[PDB]
Amino acid sequence: DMILTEEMQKIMNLIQDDENNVFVTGKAGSGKTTFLKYLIEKSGKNCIVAAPTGIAAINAGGVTLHSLFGIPFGPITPYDRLENKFSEYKVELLLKMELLIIDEISMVRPDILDTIDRKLRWVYESDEPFGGVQVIMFGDLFQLPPVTKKQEREILSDFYDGFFFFNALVFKRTGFHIVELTKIFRQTEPEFINVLNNIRNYQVTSDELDLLSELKDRKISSSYDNEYIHICTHKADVEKINADKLGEQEIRNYDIVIKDKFPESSIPCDLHLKLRVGARVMSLVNDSLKGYYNGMLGIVTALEDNVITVRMDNGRTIKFERYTWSNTQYTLKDNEIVKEEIGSCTQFPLTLAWAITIHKSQGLTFDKIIIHVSHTFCPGQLYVALSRCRTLEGIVSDAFITKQMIIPEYALIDFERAYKSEGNYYGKR
């Protein structure tokens, strides 16, 4: 499958030198997911992939940071006492890890990175950052920030100049290169790219504000029988829409199947998938052979015990069977890091898709979207919502988009401009 770009090769060139840490970033559709898999195989190193959330871990074929390093969920200051209780086997593992890959890095709080630094220095009995382990970080820099609890904000604000990963104190003692994957190759047409970038950076023109007001359409935005997906801020709103459209007649239910050990928060699919013929659905996974991708939309045309038949918007009928997600953990075999499965969950990789939250839609793109506007958007939120459509022409809004909704996240903007202006590098050296 995978197209190797000059940017990807630049990352692989950088990684040759054990002393180079790297941040791999880029928008949805720029090949981060596939390139992550590639990088692991071609690294020639004992690699562990970790992520801040269970779903991200599952999908990257790795483990949560919390599981791996025994880190609690809540905020830890650099001087707080650390539970340094690793099993013997965990110590052996971490001492063989040459390369740590952290996926979804923008969802990693800076204290977490500092706790990882501290624990690895403890394990390696070393003063070098991260115990001398090479670190690669992956993620869309402009993925929507995790919601900060006011107590977290209280705790961490004393030490950190911001609530992003790059604010970690360890970056006073080490640093990293940045390479942005900028291909995507089909998100492409000039007016739209410029609009999105200007929204991201809070420099929209009057003409662009006019462009945005033209997205309002009461008729389309109030219909649930077009091929438009409704993009909402809140989970409850989405649940109400999907439930109302589903109805209560001729509903089939399919329960998730759990085998052995599976964390609650790693479950990436519906627990109880309720469907009817005619239901609007989205694929949750990529399958080359059957020909569907994550985010692909369609209509349920049959419901059987072991097969759900769907007519995709591209007109093709696909037989969906249950998919198995494996919960793996890393171990050692003959001096190498390998994975072993310790549990799994099995479910049809489909979910109702009349509506989707802005959060669950991250990393996806659609042909036709309805943005449900809010007067309480967060920084970056409008940007992320609009970037869920492949074209400007495919977007409608339920109310007029105004400059009030165009809220920049300057911490992120300024970070990008910082590393770009300093040789695509951030931190010490």
Helix (H), strand (E), coil (C) string for 63-107:
EEHHHHHCCCCCCCCCCCCCCCCCCHHHHHHHHHCCEEEECCHHH
Cα-Cα-Cα-Cα dihedral sign, residues 257, 263, 265, 266: negative
28-51 burial, b if ≥16 CB within 10 A, otherwise e? bbbbbbebbebbbeebeebbbbbb
| Domain that residue 133 falls in | 6-185+411-427
Name the nearest CA neighbour of 384 among 208, 196, 186, 195: 196
Q: How far is Cα 61 from Cα 360, in angstroms, rounded to an integer? A: 19
- Resolution, angstroms, 1 dp: 1.7
CB distance 40 to 34 below 8 Å = no
CA angle at residue 243 from 242 to 245, to 5 degrees? 65
Q: How far is Cα 178 from Cα 187, in angstroms, rounded to an integer? A: 22
CB distance 49 to 339 below 8 Å = no
User: Residue 180: what are its φ and ψ, rounded to 5°?
Assistant: -95, 125
The residues near 411 (Cβ < 8 Å, ≥ 6 apart) are: 162, 163, 164
Name the nearest CA neighbour of 74 among 168, 161, 162, 151: 151
Per the listing, tokens 């740590």 go with 100
The residues near 138 (Cβ < 8 Å, ≥ 6 apart) are: 23, 24, 25, 32, 36, 101, 102, 103, 104, 105
State the structure-solving technique.
X-ray
Q: How far is Cα 379 from Cα 127, in angstroms, rounded to an integer? A: 38
Name the nearest CA neighbour of 282 among 320, 335, 337: 320
Tokens standing for residue 119: 């624990």
Cα torsion 390, 101, 168, 78 to 10°: value is 140
User: Residue 268: what are its φ and ψ, rounded to 5°?
Assistant: -105, 10
Kind and range of the H or E element at 298? strand 297-303
CB distance 31 to 3 below 8 Å = yes
Q: Which residues pair with 281 in a beta bridge?
A: 298, 352
CATH number at residue 38: 3.40.50.300
Q: How far is Cα 142 from Cα 117, in angstroms, rounded to an integer? A: 24
* Three-class secondary structure of residue 15 per DSSP: helix
CA angle at residue 24 from 30 to 291, to 5 degrees? 35
CA angle at residue 148 from 145 to 151, to 5 degrees? 165
Could you tell me whether strands 252-255 and 323-333 are parallel, antiparallel, or unpaired per DSSP bridges? unpaired
Q: How far is Cα 328 from Cα 340, in angstroms, rounded to an integer? A: 5
Cα-Cα-Cα-Cα dihedral sign, residues 146, 48, 68, 270: positive
Q: Which residues pair with 292 in a beta bridge?
A: 287
Name the nearest CA neighbour of 320 among 341, 337, 305: 305
CB distance 218 to 398 below 8 Å = yes
Name the nearest CA neighbour of 370 among 354, 352, 346, 381: 354
Q: How far is Cα 325 from Cα 267, in angstroms, rounded to an integer? A: 8
Q: Cα 75 to the chain's mean position, in Å?
A: 21
Helices 6-15 and 32-43 meet at what angle, rounded to 10? 40
Name the nearest CA neighbour of 145 among 420, 384, 386: 384
Q: Which residues pair with 336 in a beta bridge?
A: 333
Tokens standing for residue 220: 């389309």
Q: How far is Cα 38 from Cα 307, in angstroms, rounded to an integer? A: 32
Q: How far is Cα 160 from Cα 199, in angstroms, rounded to an integer? A: 27
Helices 190-201 and 206-213 meet at what angle, rounded to 10? 110
Ramachandran category for residue 306: left, alpha or beta (phi over 0 → left; psi -120 to 50 → alpha): alpha
Instruction: Give me the DSSP letters along 232-281.
Output: ES-HHHHHHHHHHHH-SSS-EEEE-EEEE---GGG--S-SEEEE-TT-EE
